[PDB]
Design a protein around this nucleic acid. Structure first.
Length: 61
DNA sequence: TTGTGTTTTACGAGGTCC
DNA sequence: GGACCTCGTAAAACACAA
């Protein structure tokens, strides 16, 4: 399930970089992420969802 | 070098919008 | 009729006090 495989350094750099661009992934960007990073379109979608969860948690507060 | 507590992937139950 | 969302959740992997 199915089953957790941590993302690499260069991958996360690409992810967090285009996340800093704006919180929500566009269809266009997801293509070129998926190529540059070798993750599936679904993974990126899920990661972006999980990124915003983490950002919400920053409300300590 | 270990626990054990927090972070990181990955999903299914609910939802909006179209 | 799917594409995508915030969310609770599990569980591997992480990051520290010891």
């Amino acid at each position: 399930r199915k089953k957790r495989i941590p993302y690499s350094k260069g991958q996360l750099r690409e992810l967090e970089r285009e996340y800093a661009a704006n919180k929500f992934i566009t269809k266009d960007k997801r293509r070129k992420i998926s190529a540059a990073t070798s993750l599936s379109e679904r993974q990126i979608t899920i990661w972006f969802q999980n990124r915003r969860v983490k950002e919400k948690k920053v409300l300590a507060k």
